[PDB]
Amino acid sequence: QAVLLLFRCATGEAWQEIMLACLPGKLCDPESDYNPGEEYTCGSNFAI
Amino acid sequence: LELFIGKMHKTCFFADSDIVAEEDPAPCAFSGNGRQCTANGTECRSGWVGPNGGITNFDNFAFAMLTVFQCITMEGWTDVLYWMNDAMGFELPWVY
Amino acid sequence: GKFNFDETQTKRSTFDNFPQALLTVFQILTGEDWNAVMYDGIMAYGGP
Amino acid sequence: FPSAVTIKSWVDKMQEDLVTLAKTASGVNQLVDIYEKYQDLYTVEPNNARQLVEIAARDIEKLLSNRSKALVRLALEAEKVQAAHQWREDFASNEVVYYNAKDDEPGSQRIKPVFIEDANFGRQISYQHAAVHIPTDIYEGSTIVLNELNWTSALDEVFKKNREEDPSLLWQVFGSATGLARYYPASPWVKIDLYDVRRRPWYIQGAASPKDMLILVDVSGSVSGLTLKLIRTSVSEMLETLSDDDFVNVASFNSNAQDVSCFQHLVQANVRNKKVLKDAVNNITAKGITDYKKGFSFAFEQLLNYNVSRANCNKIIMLFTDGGEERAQEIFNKYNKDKKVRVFTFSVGQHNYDRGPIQWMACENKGYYYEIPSIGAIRINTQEYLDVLGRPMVLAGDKAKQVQWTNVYLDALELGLVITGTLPVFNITGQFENKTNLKNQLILGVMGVDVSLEDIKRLTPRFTLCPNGYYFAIDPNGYVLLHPNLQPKPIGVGIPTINSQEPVTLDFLDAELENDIKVEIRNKMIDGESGEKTFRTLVKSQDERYIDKGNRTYTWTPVNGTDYSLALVLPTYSFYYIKAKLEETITQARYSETLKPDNFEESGYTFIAPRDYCNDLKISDNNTEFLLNFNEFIDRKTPNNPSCNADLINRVLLDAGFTNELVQNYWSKQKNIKGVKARFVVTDGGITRVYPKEAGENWQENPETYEDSFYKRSLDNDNYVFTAPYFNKSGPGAYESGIMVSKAVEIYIQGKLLKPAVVGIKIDVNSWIENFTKRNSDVMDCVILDDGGFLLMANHDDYTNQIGRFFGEIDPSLMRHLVNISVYAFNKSYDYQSVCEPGAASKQSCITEQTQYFFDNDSKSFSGVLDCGNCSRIFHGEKLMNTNLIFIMVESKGTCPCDTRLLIQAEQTSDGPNPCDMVKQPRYRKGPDVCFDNNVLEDYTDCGGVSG
Ligand SMILES: *[C@@H]1O[C@H](CO)[C@@H](O[C@@H]2O[C@H](CO)[C@@H](O[C@@H]3O[C@H](CO)[C@@H](O[C@@H]4O[C@H](CO)[C@@H](O)[C@H](O)[C@H]4NC(C)=O)[C@H](O)[C@H]3NC(C)=O)[C@H](O)[C@H]2NC(C)=O)[C@H](O)[C@H]1NC(C)=O
């Protein structure tokens, strides 16, 4: 899936929209390991 | 035409009504392999028009040729790929 | 003037006057979202 | 076929059997003697029609004078308090403290109230402060709201002072032009909330005088798409700001001007007419070029018609365009050179056209310019035109301050049917020096006070007169403020086909059966003049199944303070009533034991009317605990009754002795009769006794005497009345109840005809079957019908099983011919307050058509031949004496194999009458004589263009 996303960005479809979706203020999937209370931590300023 | 014929016609509907349950509808599973409705009071059946109002589909030679040309031009091919991923599984459409 | 079929929204990439048609032609030449304008033009003449 | 003389022998033998059984078993003559044997426990008092109306008209006039004083008091303080306001711009430390409704803060502090439970209020309220309602679209905590929310805090002192003088006071509300409504007493607000106080009928009627709105709609090619449905929604919301005092029409122009509907001129803009325009404006399409010259000429010419009824008030043109390059200087110069007509222009939709001519057409014509770019701006921009129309009213000053009363409408806070008095509030800051005069041309808001229809009903008592008499009040538009037939439901329009913000405006002619004389009475009542008329009228029954003719007397007078007219309908045999005269204890006490539930065997099951005998004793609408709460009260409260009225208590107690005397002295002698299933007696006092204790349960009748259909039916008729049981298992009434017979007693005390009570029995249908035969004949059919064509007795088994059913639904060929030969008449009416199951394009309100049948000719013998085609059917019909029954004889349906469509007498969901041909000859009405338009001092120097 990561390779498919990178191929999509290489073709230049919505890569800026994906970058916006990868911003720091994003919800975290339940299956990940995170402390209770901080649901919105995943995503980083490294995305740009 | 041989593979994806008449498969973009099943969207999440409402219980015993002709109202689409999504603001941006996507196809359901043609044979229980793709995407299924998750909402408690929604079911999906046939009779849907299509993803882009019926323009983009593979259920005719003209439609298939037009969507193949559009995919070749790099514009909106991921939309068709994701609609295929909703209709059928994840393994066949990505090869095409 | 044939892009008034939706009745629920106003479209920005139209052929209303000369500047707007010129901008739409330029945008199609750039290749970005040309399929959306094609879909609008097809739906303006009776759809599929 | 038997001869005519032979049939009369059959009828006379059975008529004597029926009448004798009904007369002897019920005891009609025994109760008549019982009433006449005493003649000293009660007195006969006259029912003066002229005095009754005038006394009640003065009570209503005084009641509305209570509320006018409150409105004047509230309006005086609101103007004075607001005039001493400084327009603070910061509310950080000087926070505004108030109780906001519909809640579970820059400068606002909330209030937590106690919300005790109070009577005469269907919810929890609080007299400690006043509640504030702010619409969802309006942000609380803004500079405009907070300033409006600070000076309005002084209204609470007057709110409490008003209730101190008059404890029986309903909602008092101040509707601000800002948008927020502050009402007293505080009460939590009632899905999402779309309530705006500026769109309420009472606010709109006080913001401006009536109008002559004419809507011009641009249906040219350029408006197709989003901006077409924006105009259609905008026009529909604009029609919601009109009332029955305003006249409107809608026209569209695209290279040619025409009306969008069938009206062709201005119409009264009531519920029926506004529905037609709303439906017609939703069918318009955009095509062609734009012609403003041909569009305004059509609009200006329709405002100079004067053929028909109008408002003779504000004449406005509301243009719904997007943009254009044509100003039409010549049209405005030619038609309104003196600027006698305002022009309001709306630029609707997201477009890139020229708004210059659109803006200019408003400023030069004393109008305003509005922009509606999207759906979210439709609701706010379609109500702002009342600010412009209110300019001449504020400049009038004191003379433009009169209390106006609205139509009957359902309260938003679930209080029932209410009316509201309205008084506008002006901005008079700097008026003591007359220097600002710029924002002082707009009203601050509207002050309102509610009056319940229950309050009006208390001033018109009905228990001193017969159940067939009643009061009813009228409004200058013809609608009924008070009527027995008015119901707390919205009036429907058309048939609901789906895949309470309007007033309950029910006309007098639609409340009851129309007549030629009634129109003359209504016209006299509308203009206002006392009168009196006695005439013969046909009256519908409580159950919409029977029609009977009886003499009636109408006595009407106008109410002084307001424009309402009060009338009292009072038949004969009711100009005199029985007033109980007994104060001794042991005589009164012995009647109180008769009501003891225990003795429901010796005294027969007893019911009690749920009347308001005393304040503390509350009604229960079950007649099980209420009876228990009655005898316990009468055995616990002293006879003085400081707060309980004794006129009702003496009336019911007197009849308890009168009724039990029939039960004990006469009914107990005949414990069981072969053909009698039950014996009953109903009295004006409000007690019903059924001898078979058992039968008590089978009694599917209202415990209140004044709502019993068979009781009123027996009063008009001077013979035995047979009531057909309801069909389709509407409770147990098929074979375990029987045919109900009733007969009203007639009393002559001093030459005065009195009908205090009715008596009757329930005929055993099985026993009647045996006597009828003395069976399943395939040669001839023998059926007995009542006044109304309902089957009561047959000899074909299958006919008998469907007892109490309309004869047209089981033998349409014979029933249809009977109407033609003029033995059965019928008149059809419309029931506007009815609910029906929706059909294809829960339940919704709709209009239903009711038909009722009654005897037309007075002749008793009817014979003829029915021609159904390729066959022949011969019948003979005789009517039994001293009853409403007709016996007819005809051969079998199988002799002639013809079956036409069945005749239906039931609630039919119709949509009539047609409104396209009622506006040609509309009902007479009188409009307000006050108008506030075209004032010299009006500024009109600001529109939406200069500011926009
Ligand atoms: C009854 O009528 C009186 C006048 O006859 C009226 O009192 C006047 O109210 C207005 C406000 O509506 C005051 O206007 C002052 O001047 C401007 C006008 O808005 C304000 O300055 C900014 O204006 C912009 C818009 O142009 C606005 O967005 C902004 O918020 C304003 N404030 C800023 C930027 O700080 C002034 O703030 C405003 N107030 C002042 C100067 O105190 C008049 O001053 C008032 N005149 C008098 C004599 O009091 C009164 O509101 C009317 N009653 C009701 C209920 O409306």
Ligand SMILES: *[C@@H]1O[C@H](CO)[C@@H](O[C@@H]2O[C@H](CO)[C@@H](O[C@@H]3O[C@H](CO)[C@@H](O)[C@H](O)[C@H]3NC(C)=O)[C@H](O)[C@H]2NC(C)=O)[C@H](O)[C@H]1NC(C)=O
């Ligand atoms: C609009 O809001 C204003 C701000 O809250 C209100 O003005 C305040 O009213 C208070 C109640 O009277 C005043 O308190 C007292 O005022 C008297 C009158 O001069 C004086 O004794 C003192 O100023 C004060 N007493 C004390 C503090 O013990 C406030 O002074 C006054 N001004 C403020 C708070 O800035 C208005 O009442 C309000 N308008 C309406 C109609 O309610």
Ligand SMILES: *[C@@H]1O[C@H](CO)[C@@H](O[C@@H]2O[C@H](CO)[C@@H](O)[C@H](O)[C@H]2NC(C)=O)[C@H](O)[C@H]1NC(C)=O
């Ligand atoms: C009613 O309005 C009409 C115009 O809308 C006025 O004009 C007359 O109309 C009637 C027939 O509709 C005729 O008398 C003539 O055709 C018109 N002219 C005149 C001089 O009468 C009419 O005057 C208005 N009033 C009446 C009573 O018709």
Ligand SMILES: *[C@@H]1O[C@H](CO)[C@@H](O[C@@H]2O[C@H](CO)[C@@H](O)[C@H](O)[C@H]2NC(C)=O)[C@H](O)[C@H]1NC(C)=O
């Ligand atoms: C409404 O006011 C009028 C007068 O404006 C009242 O007319 C009175 O009629 C009685 C006879 O019925 C006369 O004796 C009085 O002299 C009249 N009043 C005056 C002031 O002259 C009329 O009665 C009032 N309406 C009601 C219901 O009382």
Ligand SMILES: *[C@@H]1O[C@H](CO)[C@@H](O[C@@H]2O[C@H](CO)[C@@H](O)[C@H](O)[C@H]2NC(C)=O)[C@H](O)[C@H]1NC(C)=O
């Ligand atoms: C109610 O009664 C009958 C319905 O059958 C109608 O009155 C008769 O109408 C006919 C129609 O031409 C007249 O010839 C008769 O003279 C009328 N009978 C009368 C006036 O007694 C009518 O539908 C209703 N009557 C009203 C409204 O007065």
Ligand SMILES: *[C@@H]1O[C@H](CO)[C@@H](O)[C@H](O)[C@H]1NC(C)=O
């Ligand atoms: C209010 O009405 C009553 C009767 O309806 C009347 O007696 C009274 O004078 C009126 N005014 C006040 C202030 O009670």
Ligand SMILES: [Ca+2]
């Ligand atoms: Ca692209």
Ligand SMILES: [Ca+2]
């Ligand atoms: Ca146009």
